[PDB]
Amino acid sequence: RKEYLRKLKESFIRRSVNTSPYARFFILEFQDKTDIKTVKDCIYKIQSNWSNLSKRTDRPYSPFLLFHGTSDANLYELKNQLFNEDLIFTDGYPFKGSVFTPKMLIEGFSNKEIHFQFINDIDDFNETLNSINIRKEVYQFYTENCLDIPSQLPQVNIQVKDFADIKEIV
Amino acid sequence: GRKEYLRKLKESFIRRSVNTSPYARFFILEFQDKTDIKTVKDCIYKIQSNWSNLSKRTDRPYSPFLLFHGTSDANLYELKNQLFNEDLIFTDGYPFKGSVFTPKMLIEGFSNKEIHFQFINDIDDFNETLNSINIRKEVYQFYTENCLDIPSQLPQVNIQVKDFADIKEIV
Amino acid sequence: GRKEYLRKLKESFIRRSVNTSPYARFFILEFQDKTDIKTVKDCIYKIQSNWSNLSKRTDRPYSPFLLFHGTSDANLYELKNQLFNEDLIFTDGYPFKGSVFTPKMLIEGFSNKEIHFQFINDIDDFNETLNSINIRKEVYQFYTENCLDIPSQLPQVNIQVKDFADIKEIV
Amino acid sequence: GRKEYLRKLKESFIRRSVNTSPYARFFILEFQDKTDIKTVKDCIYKIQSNWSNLSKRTDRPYSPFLLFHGTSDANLYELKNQLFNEDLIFTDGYPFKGSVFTPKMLIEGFSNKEIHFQFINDIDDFNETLNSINIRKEVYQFYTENCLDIPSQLPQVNIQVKDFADIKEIV
Amino acid sequence: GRKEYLRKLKESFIRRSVNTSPYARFFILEFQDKTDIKTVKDCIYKIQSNWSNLSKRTDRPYSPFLLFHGTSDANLYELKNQLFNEDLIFTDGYPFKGSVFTPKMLIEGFSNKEIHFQFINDIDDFNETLNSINIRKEVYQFYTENCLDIPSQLPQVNIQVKDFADIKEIV
Amino acid sequence: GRKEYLRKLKESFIRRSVNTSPYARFFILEFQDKTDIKTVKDCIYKIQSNWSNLSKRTDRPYSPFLLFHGTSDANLYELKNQLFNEDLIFTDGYPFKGSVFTPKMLIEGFSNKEIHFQFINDIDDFNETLNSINIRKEVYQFYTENCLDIPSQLPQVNIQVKDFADIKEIV
Structure with a gap:
C-alpha cells in the first residue's frame, strides 16, 4: 500500500523540482461516493504545496482547481465550506448573475x-485556457472517468483507487 | 520492539508538522483516574511545543486546543492549577468566576x-467552540479505553495507546 | 532496469552543480518533425530554468543559447511564436522584420x-554567432538520428537519445 | 562495545528532545571519593555547554542546576573553587560569607x-530551591551506586553508569 | 574501473574541502604537443574556478599559479592568447614587450x-618567483611522462595521469 | 585497511564538532630530528586552521598553544623563522632579545x-604558562617514541602515531 503511493509521487508530480509560477491546473474527479471532508483535505494539500503567496516573493502563483462528475448540490456546498474557512478563491463569477469572467x-x-x-x-x-498566456500544466487525478484535455497542453493523468490517495501524491 | 510501535503510530495518523499551517488543532487526550498528573503535563508541554508557533517573526500564529475526558473535575482542575503556576498560560472561555462559556x-x-x-x-x-472557529479545524484523539464521539464533518484521527506515557513521543 | 540509462547520461557529461559559471552555453536539439511542439517547449523550459541565472542578486547573469536543426521553418516559427506568447522572452538576432542577422x-x-x-x-x-562571443563557449548537442558538425576548437559533448522526451530530464 | 551501551543511553533514557526551552533542568551527579576532580569538571563543562543557552540573540535564557552527593565537603569546595577560577561563574545561593541560603x-x-x-x-x-522555582522542572539523575531520593511530583530520569567518565558522553 | 581509480587519485592526492585558505598554490601541468589546446583550457578553467576566491565579500583573495612544461613556445603563446581573449585575465610578470620578469x-x-x-x-x-611569495606555498604537479624537480622545502604532490583529460576531473 | 587507523585515532579522542569553545588548548608534538622541517609546517598550519577562531564576527577568539620536544634548538629556531616569514604570526613570551619568559x-x-x-x-x-592561564586548559599530546610528562590536574590525551605525517590527518 505504502509502496504503491511512493511510485506515483516520484514519477509524475515532482513537487520539489517545480517551483516556477506556472498556471497549474489540478483536475479532480469528484463523485457521490466520496465525501466533502476528504476533498477539502486534498484541496488544502494542493494549495499549500503548489502556491507561493509569501510576502518576500515577486512572482506569486496559485493553483487552478477543477472538479467533474459530481452534482452542483455538493459542488457548491464544498465551495461554501471552503470560503468559510478563509480559503479565498475565485471562479470568474464575482457577483450573482455574472457571466464567466476569465480576468x-x-x-x-x-x-x-x-x-x-x-x-x-x-x-x-x-475559456480559461485561451485567456492565460503563460505556460500551463494540467494534472489530472481520477478513479473511473477521465477528461478530454486539449492535446496542445502538457498533461499528466494519474489513476488512483479512490480520492484519499490524491493528497499524498500532491 | 516498543520502538517500532511508536514509529508506526507516529507516521500512520499523526504527521510531523502538518505543513506548519495555522489550523484549529484539537488534541483530545483521555485522562483516567489511574493516570498520574505529571505524565499528562509532559504530554501537554510536548503538544504545546510542537503544535504552536508563538515566535515574534511570524504574522500567522497558532496554538493547540486541549480537551480531556474520562476524569473527575477534582484532578482536572488540579492539573490546570499547576500549569498556570509554571507560566504555561492558557484560556478556557471562563475569564472570571461565575462566567458563562465565552468561546471568543x-x-x-x-x-x-x-x-x-x-x-x-x-x-x-x-x-460550542467548534461553531465559533471558522478556519479549518482538525481533531487528534489519543485514547486507551474510551473514545469520544466527534462530529463527522471534521478531519479526525483516532489513535489507540497502551497507556498515557506513549502519547508524548507520538506528537 | 530502465532508468539506469537516464542516470548514466546525466552523470557522464552534463552536471548542473559545478556549472554555475557564466559561460556561453549552446544547446543544440534535433527537431525531427515527428515530435510535437509540446515536448520541445518542455525541453526549452527545463533548459532555461536550469542553465540561466537571471536573478537580481547576481551581478554576472547568463542565458543559454538554443539551436534547432533538421526541421522546417513552418514549425520552427510556430514554436517561436508560442514561446513569446508564454512570456519566455528571447532574441534571435532579428530585432525587426527584414533585418540582417545582428549578433549583438x-x-x-x-x-x-x-x-x-x-x-x-x-x-x-x-x-556567425560563435565569432561574436569572446568568453568561453560550450556546445551541448542532443540528437537522435542526425548530428551537427561542430567546429573542433569548441568544448563539445554529444548525447544520443531514444527520443526528444529524454532530453528534458537529462538537463 | 563500550560505545554501544552509551549510544542507546544517549538516545533512549536521555536525549536532546525538547531543548532550547527555558526549563529548570536539575542535573544530579554522584561525586564519589574514587572519582577524581578532573573528570567532574569535564562533565560540568559538557552539561553547561549543551544544556544552557546564554547567547545575546535570545531573550529567554536558561542555565542548568548542578547537585552533587556522596562526597565530602573538602573536595566539593575544591571543585567549586577551580570552576570559579576558570571563569565558569555560578551561584549556590550564598552570595557572601556567613549567608543564609538565598534561592532568589x-x-x-x-x-x-x-x-x-x-x-x-x-x-x-x-x-528549598524546588519550591522557589515556579517554572517546569526536570531532574536528570546520574549515579553509579547510590541514588538520591527525588519528590514524585517532578519528572525524573535515572541513569546508572559504570563510572563517572560515561556521563560526559551520555549528556 | 576508470571511475574507481579516478576517485582514488582525486581523494588521496588532493583534499578539496579543507584548502580554502589563501596559500600560494602552484599548479604544474605537463603540456605535450599531442595535447590539444581545448583540453588544456578546460583544465585551466577548472583549476581557476575551484582554487580562486575573488568574490567581493572576502578580504583575503587568492589565485592559483599556473605552470606548463614540455611544450613549444608557439602553442604556449597561442594558449595564452586564447585565454586572454575569453576574459580570463592573468598575469605572467611581463607587463610590456621587452620587459624583464617582474615577480611583483x-x-x-x-x-x-x-x-x-x-x-x-x-x-x-x-x-625566481618562489623567492618572492613569502606566505605558504604548495606545488601540485600533474604529469604523464616527464616530471619536474621541485625544490625540496616546498610541500609537493605528484600525480601521474594517463592523459590530460582526467586532470580536470581531479581538480 | 590503513585508512581505518587514521579514522579510529581521529574519532576516539579529537572531535571538532564537540569543542567549539575558547579553551586554552595545548598541542604537544614530538619533533624528533628524523622528520624534516617541511612536514611540521603542514601539521602546524592544520592545527592553527582547525583549532582557532580569529574571525571578526566572534567576540571570544582563541588560538592553540603548540609545544615541541625532543629536537635541538637549531631546527626549532629554524622552524620558528620560516613560520614567521610565511605570515603565520605567533608569540612565545620573548618579545625581545634578553627577555625573560613573559606568559602575559x-x-x-x-x-x-x-x-x-x-x-x-x-x-x-x-x-610556567600553565599557572598563568586561568581558563580551562586541555592538552593534546602526539608522539612517536618519547611521551612528555603532563601534570595530572589537566585533561590530557596521548595519541601514539606511526610518524609525524599522520598527525595532520587526526587534527
Whole structure:
C-alpha cells in the first residue's frame, strides 16, 4: 500500500523540482461516493504545496482547481465550506448573475490574498485556457472517468483507487 | 520492539508538522483516574511545543486546543492549577468566576502569542467552540479505553495507546 | 532496469552543480518533425530554468543559447511564436522584420535578465554567432538520428537519445 | 562495545528532545571519593555547554542546576573553587560569607547570561530551591551506586553508569 | 574501473574541502604537443574556478599559479592568447614587450580580484618567483611522462595521469 | 585497511564538532630530528586552521598553544623563522632579545586575532604558562617514541602515531 503511493509521487508530480509560477491546473474527479471532508483535505494539500503567496516573493502563483462528475448540490456546498474557512478563491463569477469572467481568474493567479482558483465546469475551463498566456500544466487525478484535455497542453493523468490517495501524491 | 510501535503510530495518523499551517488543532487526550498528573503535563508541554508557533517573526500564529475526558473535575482542575503556576498560560472561555462559556476568548487566545494553548473543559464547551472557529479545524484523539464521539464533518484521527506515557513521543 | 540509462547520461557529461559559471552555453536539439511542439517547449523550459541565472542578486547573469536543426521553418516559427506568447522572452538576432542577422542582440541578451534565452535560426547564424562571443563557449548537442558538425576548437559533448522526451530530464 | 551501551543511553533514557526551552533542568551527579576532580569538571563543562543557552540573540535564557552527593565537603569546595577560577561563574545561593541560603540568587542566575550554571550543595538546598522555582522542572539523575531520593511530583530520569567518565558522553 | 581509480587519485592526492585558505598554490601541468589546446583550457578553467576566491565579500583573495612544461613556445603563446581573449585575465610578470620578469606583478595579481590566475612561462621564472611569495606555498604537479624537480622545502604532490583529460576531473 | 587507523585515532579522542569553545588548548608534538622541517609546517598550519577562531564576527577568539620536544634548538629556531616569514604570526613570551619568559604575551596573544598561535619553547615555559592561564586548559599530546610528562590536574590525551605525517590527518 505504502509502496504503491511512493511510485506515483516520484514519477509524475515532482513537487520539489517545480517551483516556477506556472498556471497549474489540478483536475479532480469528484463523485457521490466520496465525501466533502476528504476533498477539502486534498484541496488544502494542493494549495499549500503548489502556491507561493509569501510576502518576500515577486512572482506569486496559485493553483487552478477543477472538479467533474459530481452534482452542483455538493459542488457548491464544498465551495461554501471552503470560503468559510478563509480559503479565498475565485471562479470568474464575482457577483450573482455574472457571466464567466476569465480576468478574475487571471488577477487571482498573481493575487497574494487569493489562495487558489475554482473552475465550475468544462466550458469555464476551456475559456480559461485561451485567456492565460503563460505556460500551463494540467494534472489530472481520477478513479473511473477521465477528461478530454486539449492535446496542445502538457498533461499528466494519474489513476488512483479512490480520492484519499490524491493528497499524498500532491 | 516498543520502538517500532511508536514509529508506526507516529507516521500512520499523526504527521510531523502538518505543513506548519495555522489550523484549529484539537488534541483530545483521555485522562483516567489511574493516570498520574505529571505524565499528562509532559504530554501537554510536548503538544504545546510542537503544535504552536508563538515566535515574534511570524504574522500567522497558532496554538493547540486541549480537551480531556474520562476524569473527575477534582484532578482536572488540579492539573490546570499547576500549569498556570509554571507560566504555561492558557484560556478556557471562563475569564472570571461565575462566567458563562465565552468561546471568543478561545478565538483570541488562538492568535495570541502570550497564550500558549487553549483548554476545553468538557463536551458542551467543545461543540460550542467548534461553531465559533471558522478556519479549518482538525481533531487528534489519543485514547486507551474510551473514545469520544466527534462530529463527522471534521478531519479526525483516532489513535489507540497502551497507556498515557506513549502519547508524548507520538506528537 | 530502465532508468539506469537516464542516470548514466546525466552523470557522464552534463552536471548542473559545478556549472554555475557564466559561460556561453549552446544547446543544440534535433527537431525531427515527428515530435510535437509540446515536448520541445518542455525541453526549452527545463533548459532555461536550469542553465540561466537571471536573478537580481547576481551581478554576472547568463542565458543559454538554443539551436534547432533538421526541421522546417513552418514549425520552427510556430514554436517561436508560442514561446513569446508564454512570456519566455528571447532574441534571435532579428530585432525587426527584414533585418540582417545582428549578433549583438545575442551578446546583449546573454547578459540581460529580462531575456530568458537566445534562439539561433540556422547553422549560418550559429557560425556567425560563435565569432561574436569572446568568453568561453560550450556546445551541448542532443540528437537522435542526425548530428551537427561542430567546429573542433569548441568544448563539445554529444548525447544520443531514444527520443526528444529524454532530453528534458537529462538537463 | 563500550560505545554501544552509551549510544542507546544517549538516545533512549536521555536525549536532546525538547531543548532550547527555558526549563529548570536539575542535573544530579554522584561525586564519589574514587572519582577524581578532573573528570567532574569535564562533565560540568559538557552539561553547561549543551544544556544552557546564554547567547545575546535570545531573550529567554536558561542555565542548568548542578547537585552533587556522596562526597565530602573538602573536595566539593575544591571543585567549586577551580570552576570559579576558570571563569565558569555560578551561584549556590550564598552570595557572601556567613549567608543564609538565598534561592532568589538562583532565580536570577537561571536567567542571567553571565552566570553559566547553578550549584546546589546538598539535599536541603535542593528541596528549598524546588519550591522557589515556579517554572517546569526536570531532574536528570546520574549515579553509579547510590541514588538520591527525588519528590514524585517532578519528572525524573535515572541513569546508572559504570563510572563517572560515561556521563560526559551520555549528556 | 576508470571511475574507481579516478576517485582514488582525486581523494588521496588532493583534499578539496579543507584548502580554502589563501596559500600560494602552484599548479604544474605537463603540456605535450599531442595535447590539444581545448583540453588544456578546460583544465585551466577548472583549476581557476575551484582554487580562486575573488568574490567581493572576502578580504583575503587568492589565485592559483599556473605552470606548463614540455611544450613549444608557439602553442604556449597561442594558449595564452586564447585565454586572454575569453576574459580570463592573468598575469605572467611581463607587463610590456621587452620587459624583464617582474615577480611583483605576480605578487599583486595574487591578491587582485580582477586577475583570475597567474601564468608562469618556464622553470627560470618559476624559481625566481618562489623567492618572492613569502606566505605558504604548495606545488601540485600533474604529469604523464616527464616530471619536474621541485625544490625540496616546498610541500609537493605528484600525480601521474594517463592523459590530460582526467586532470580536470581531479581538480 | 590503513585508512581505518587514521579514522579510529581521529574519532576516539579529537572531535571538532564537540569543542567549539575558547579553551586554552595545548598541542604537544614530538619533533624528533628524523622528520624534516617541511612536514611540521603542514601539521602546524592544520592545527592553527582547525583549532582557532580569529574571525571578526566572534567576540571570544582563541588560538592553540603548540609545544615541541625532543629536537635541538637549531631546527626549532629554524622552524620558528620560516613560520614567521610565511605570515603565520605567533608569540612565545620573548618579545625581545634578553627577555625573560613573559606568559602575559601568551595571554593577550590567546585573545588576539592577529596572533595565529602560541609557541612554547620547552618544559620550563610550558609549566610556567600553565599557572598563568586561568581558563580551562586541555592538552593534546602526539608522539612517536618519547611521551612528555603532563601534570595530572589537566585533561590530557596521548595519541601514539606511526610518524609525524599522520598527525595532520587526526587534527
